[PDB]
Amino acid sequence: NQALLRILKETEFKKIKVLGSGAFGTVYKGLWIPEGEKVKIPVAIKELREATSPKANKEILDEAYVMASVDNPHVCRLLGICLTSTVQLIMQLMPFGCLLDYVREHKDNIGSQYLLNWCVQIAKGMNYLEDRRLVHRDLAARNVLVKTPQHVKITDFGLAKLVPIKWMALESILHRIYTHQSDVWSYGVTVWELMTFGSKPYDGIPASEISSILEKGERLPQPPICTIDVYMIMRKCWMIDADSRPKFRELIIEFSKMARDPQRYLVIQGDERMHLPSPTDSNFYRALMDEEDM
Ligand SMILES: Cc1cc2cc(n1)-c1cnn(C)c1OCCC[C@@H](C)CN1/C(=N/C2=O)Nc2ccc(CN3CCN(C)CC3)cc21
């Protein structure tokens, strides 16, 4: 149970470079130095921006014992925690960054086979969080990490204790109701982010007014690379009836169907010039960075 969350000493890790921030904390590239060893292992460290108390920290250690409990290839597991005056969370390092920045930076080189596979993988991790009765509350392309280009993982889960209005389902904005189906709404918006190559949803619409335009029946438009088959699925994620939104287990299957013939469903200029890596190149990544089961 508590055998998955390691409590760390200040003296056995070091923060070396600022990699990004969030809403409750800044993320650093770090180094883990085990006691009595001469190795320095790269980690990812999240320092909480607001300073907590000694009892605030029993609350943290309760979601930190759960966050360290996720055992899923497409969800990032909390590994360790360091209980300072600003609690520091230790996790595995992803040098490729988040999927949001990656798609902006590689948009001219991303084919349909990658994108559809990511959506399969994202929904697999989220279906796991549903299987684990864990509602994420902040699924977005920025909180999806890229282990290798062929393998993504979801991160930043544990923020109810601690607002991305443009990703939240209508009932969250109106009533603060967060369920697995409102994570489906967040998922459909994340798929939009991928399919538009990192565009900002509702760009120029103030967040204070989005709950209104949603109630009038307005949604995000069809991404130019998307066929209607893909967009209808996204549209089904944004239904005002939460129960009518698709389930993650169904989002997995359908996007699996689309990944077996990717060029029918996403029309990208030059899509014939970019394919998945040969089994040679897939094994090369996996032996070097990505040895887990799937
Ligand atoms: C398990 C784990 C690992 C990691 C993050 C989280 N969790 C996590 C947890 N909650 N939240 C909000 C999280 O994400 C934080 C948001 C940005 C994040 C992608 C940073 N980020 C990174 N993240 C992780 O390792 N790897 C990165 C590699 C490259 C760059 C870009 N260069 C950096 C230097 N500046 C100049 C910009 C250019 C950014 C990188």
Active site residue 261: no
Best residue for ligand 1 mutational test, from 91, 93, 98 (most atoms within 8 Å of Cβ):
98
Count of domains forming the chain: 2
- Tell me if 292 is assigned to some domain: no
Q: Which of 92, 114, 146 is the last residue of a domain?
A: 92
Residue 67 shares a structural domain with residue 118:
no
What is the resolution in angstroms? 3.1
Residues 63 and 158 in one domain: no
Do 50 and 108 belong together in one domain? no
User: What is the extent of the structural domain holding 20?
Assistant: 6-92
Is 162 found in the same domain as 37?
no
How many Å lie between the centroid of ligand 1 and the Cα of residue 156?
11
Scanning the structure block, which residue is given the tokens 């990505």? 290
The H-or-E segment that residue 190 falls in is helix 180-195
Technique behind the model = X-ray
Same domain, 88 and 116: no
Residue that is last in its domain, among 39, 71, 92: 92
Point out which residues pair with 14 in neighbouring strands: 31
The token duo for 288 is: 């070097």
131 and 185 belong to one structural domain: yes
Domain match, 164 and 223 both:
yes
Please, which residues have CB within 8 angstroms of residue 155's CB and are 6 or more apart in sequence?
75, 76, 91, 143, 144, 145
Measure the CA–CA gap between 223 and 202, rounded to whole angstroms: 13
CA distance 147 to 290: 7
Based on the number of CB atoms within 10 Å of its own CB, is 32 exposed (0-12), middle (13-18) or buried (19 or more)? buried
Residue nearest to atom 40 of ligand 1 (CA): 97
The catalytic position among 138, 156, 203, 243 is 138
Is any atom of ligand 1 closer than 6 Å to the C-beta of 143? yes
Count the neighbouring beta carbons within 10 Å of the beta carbon of residue 271: 16
* Residues near 41 by beta carbon (within 8 Å), at least 6 away in sequence: 31, 32, 33, 34
CA of 90 to the centre of ligand 1 (A): 13
Question: Which run of H or of E encompasses 95?
Answer: none
Residue 185 CA to ligand 1 center (angstroms) comes to: 24
Selection from 72, 3, 79 nearest residue 45 by Cα: 79
CATH of the domain at 51: 3.30.200.20
Identify the residue whose tokens are 């943290």.
60
Residues in the chain: 294
Residue 174 lies in a domain: yes
The answer on 10 and 142 residing in a single domain is no
SS3 at position 46: strand
Tell me: do 42 and 161 sit in the same domain: no
The token pair at 84 is 């300072």
